[PDB]
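Cross-posted from the bioinformatics board.
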Amino acid sequence: MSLQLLRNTRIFVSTVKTGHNKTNTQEILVQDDISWGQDSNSTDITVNEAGPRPTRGSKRFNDSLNAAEWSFSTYILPYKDKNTSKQIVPDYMLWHALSSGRAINLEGTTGAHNNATNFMVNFKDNSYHELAMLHIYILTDKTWSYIDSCQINQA
Amino acid sequence: MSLQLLRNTRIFVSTVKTGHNKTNTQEILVQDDISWGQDSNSTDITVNEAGPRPTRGSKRFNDSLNAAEWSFSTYILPYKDKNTSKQIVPDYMLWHALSSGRAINLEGTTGAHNNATNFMVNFKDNSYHELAMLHIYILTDKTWSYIDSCQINQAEVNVDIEDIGRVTWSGNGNQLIPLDEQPFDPDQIGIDDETYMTIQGSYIKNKLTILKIKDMDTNKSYDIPITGGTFTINNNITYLTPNVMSRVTIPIGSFTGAFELTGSLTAYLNDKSLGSMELYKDLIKTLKVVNRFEIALVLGGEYDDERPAAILVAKQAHVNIPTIETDDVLGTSVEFKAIPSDLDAGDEGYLGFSSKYTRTTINNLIVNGDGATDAVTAITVKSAGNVTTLNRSATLQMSVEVTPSSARNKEVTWAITAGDAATINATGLLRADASKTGAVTVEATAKDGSGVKGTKVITVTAGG
């Protein structure tokens, strides 16, 4: 018995559906304009006669579900973390899933990779039919939910 | 011919239109700031053309009737009636209408209801689309006039030093109606001189204003002298009217909006511990979106002898970040708004009006909810046989005593805070074992939330 407010939403970005730790999931600081959902398709079958006393009745069938839509806005907030002493943006896995389709490796030289000087994102390794795969976890007040196998469409 | 005068106008509040008796009508202690009247909406039609002969024409039409406006202020003078010997404010159905929409019932537990000790008004049953329906009767000299189906929009309570305790009511009615015939004789319904003496026996002076402020995340009660305050209860009532072109229309019922209990308290900055400055700096230091505070404003002061006082109890309030106001001597203002435990759980707050308050009475009203039910004040944990220590691997069922002996809730919890060499259960059986050579403590706090503390340092030793 409770109502859920949008202001209490918290968003976590994950690459795994189990074994969640600090290297696979981090919170993403979102704003008011956050939105998510999933629409469904249907169809009406109607009989179209021409004579007197025609049949006037319809019928609906659920036929398919559309892809889930999500969107949110975040501040560009570069900083250096104390653990690794390398400049990193908090929503770095979002940048990686946008940039390349390989497993995340900040030590490398393609996609989202950081350094002791700056955090860098290059698109030299995005030749993939399925980029790095995320799972957006949504926490509104008390109830949980998530979108399965997301992909970063744009930024 | 005969001119009607304002000073001779008397107000009567009713719950029914016919068969008015003493239990449905009363004379209200209104002041000289009364005002009422119903206005109307009108439409003007103009014509704009470009021809050689312009049509400078204007046609007016009446469209609808707006809500009837009424507003008056009354003195806060709680008292006990001789018939029931229970403390009741003279204008009790006004508080009932402000509180909940059920039938008036002083013997219940929701809405405006009295008791042998004090009159308490909760808003626990306020979750209605339409509150209790009244009928404001206005007798100016001899001509009668009443406002149909009034509902209390807000109650303006002003709490300022140099100002006597008063409350201002403002609401709306479906349609003000003038009457030629007397609905009921005012003399026997109007209060007699004896109950006027009884009412004037109790005055509430706002000069004696003491505030109880306490955060529920730190339990840092403050000592704040009040310079002046104001808290109001708002129903956000809007009347719904139909839109018909052919004929005029009148409002039809209403839907109470969002319940708002806001208040503003002005107080001088103090450098003393638990003062205004400490509260301000704590609030401006711990910038948190949500606040949870015990605010208990006590109009009229507190005394050992029975004294008239007015009480507001906001259990879980929201304190807005104060803005220190510059003046001759620094006096800050704090704004609060009581939020509920859950949006539809009620319990926004409750009030206390009575001429007979002892500090214990107001204390148990604040903590337990009623001025009649007693609450624990001090607790000393009692060992099973005046025992002071314990040896390794020995059982000890803790007992406890509570005061006063007339407390309604006497059961306490059992917990261990300082030291890790023993355990305690729900009943209080403290148990030790081997490898327990350190001193440990035991705690006890009742579930009524008085803030009582039961402590005793038991010297748990290694044993023989």
